[PDB]
Amino acid sequence: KTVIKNETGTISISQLNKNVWVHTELGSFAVPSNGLVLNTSKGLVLVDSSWDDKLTKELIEMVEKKFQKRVTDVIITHAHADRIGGIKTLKERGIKAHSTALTAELAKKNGYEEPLGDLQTVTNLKFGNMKVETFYPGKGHTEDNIVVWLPQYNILVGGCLVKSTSAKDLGNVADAYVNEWSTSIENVLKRYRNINAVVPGHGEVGDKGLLLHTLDLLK
Numbered sequence: 574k575t576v577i578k579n580e581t582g583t584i585s586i587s588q589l590n591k592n593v594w595v596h597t598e599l600g601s602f603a604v605p606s607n608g609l610v611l612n613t614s615k616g617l618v619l620v621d622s623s624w625d626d627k628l629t630k631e632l633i634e635m636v637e638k639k640f641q642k643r644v645t646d647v648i649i650t651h652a653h654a655d656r657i658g659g660i661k662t663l664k665e666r667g668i669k670a671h672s673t674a675l676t677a678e679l680a681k682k683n684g685y686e687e688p689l690g691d692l693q694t695v696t697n698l699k700f701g702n703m704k705v706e707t708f709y710p711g712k713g714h715t716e717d718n719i720v721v722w723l724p725q726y727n728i729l730v731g732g733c734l735v736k737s738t739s740a741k742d743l744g745n746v747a748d749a750y751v752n753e754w755s756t757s758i759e760n761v762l763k764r765y766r767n768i769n770a771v772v773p774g775h776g777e778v779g780d781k782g783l784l785l786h787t788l789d790l791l792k
């Protein structure tokens with residue numbers, strides 16, 4: 574798979590297909606974090622920003638240069654820093670920051686600028702030719718965590734709800750609901766029965782197996 578790094582190695586993008594890339598940044602907490610870059614005919618769309626504004630700026634600038642179009646939209650998958658840390662950069666550049674109402678409320682509570690709160694339990698978006706579904710499966714990693722589905726590729730962005738193979742514990746559970754997290758995972762497995770790739774919030778891209786791994790970690 575084609576991989577491209579910033580001048581520092583702190584930012585990397587890896588191609589999943591012609592129009593879909595994973596973006597990965599190193600923040601301190603040293604912790605890598607994943608999101609998605611969608612190359613569409615109407616502009617770039619990101620799933621999740623990054624740890625802070627410095628990295629988010631760098632990310633945007635890298636993909637805008639490479640793909641020769643603007644970042645127009647970002648989907649924020651919950652209100653923690655690795656997801657929403659760059660929200661100030663998005664707002665001041667006129668980049669639309671989509672989220673559930675709950676994610677927006679929690680962002681505000683925690684002193685972040687507010688994303689749009691436009692996403693429902695199920696929301697279907699289209700950016701040029703690129704179809705994007707957002708789904709709130711229930712509480713897990715956080716009370717507000719959502720997943721993102723690309724039905725044209727059967728690619729699932731699990732976010733921090735979904736642990737990577739390298740993860741040997743549930744990680745940061747300060748704001749988690751460990752009794753509901755299994756049901757929420759099961760809700761994802763029920764909705765998306767045929768998955769080609771699953772992108773975890775941290776770690777290597779996997780498949781449906783990452784969902785099953787997460788269930789085992791919850792026992």
Ligand SMILES: NCc1ccc(C(=O)N[C@H]2Cc3cccc(C(=O)O)c3O[B-]2(O)O)cc1
Pocket residue numbers: 602604653654655656733743744745746747748774775
């Ligand atoms: N409510 C206090 C609080 C604020 C922010 C964070 C936070 O930014 N957590 C992120 C960074 C991180 C650091 C280490 C592991 C994970 C993980 O996904 O498990 C991980 O993902 B989080 O979204 O929880 C946690 C608690």
Ligand SMILES: [Zn+2]
Pocket residue numbers: 651653714715733
């Ligand atoms: Zn989190």
Ligand SMILES: [Zn+2]
Pocket residue numbers: 655732733774775
């Ligand atoms: Zn996380």
